[PDB]
Design a binder for these strands. Structure first.
Length: 71
DNA sequence: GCCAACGTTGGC
DNA sequence: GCCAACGTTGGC
């Protein structure tokens, strides 16, 4: 239950991935996953991410929750 | 007025 | 029953 954020190598240069554990309520302990662009914009779902990156790379096998390409 | 934080819901 | 995707809002 600590927040983690650094470079995601499945994405282009300067994109970062973050995990935030929820501290309270019914879903306490669940880890939300976010991505940050080089410009600092925050993404919270894959369709949202694919609107930015989907032109400039293939995202069909990118697993948003794990941050890796499924092979 | 935003947005981090948690809940709701549809699709499987 | 699970969870991807996002709706909603208290606290700022």
């Amino acid at each position: 239950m600590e927040r983690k954020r650094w470079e995601c190598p499945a994405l282009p240069q300067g994109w970062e991935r973050e995990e935030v554990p929820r501290r309270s309520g019914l879903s306490a302990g669940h880890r939300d996953v976010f991505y940050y662009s080089p410009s600092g914009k925050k993404f919270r779902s894959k369709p949202q991410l694919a609107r930015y990156l989907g032109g400039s790379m293939d995202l069909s096998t990118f697993d948003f929750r794990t941050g890796k390409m499924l092979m």
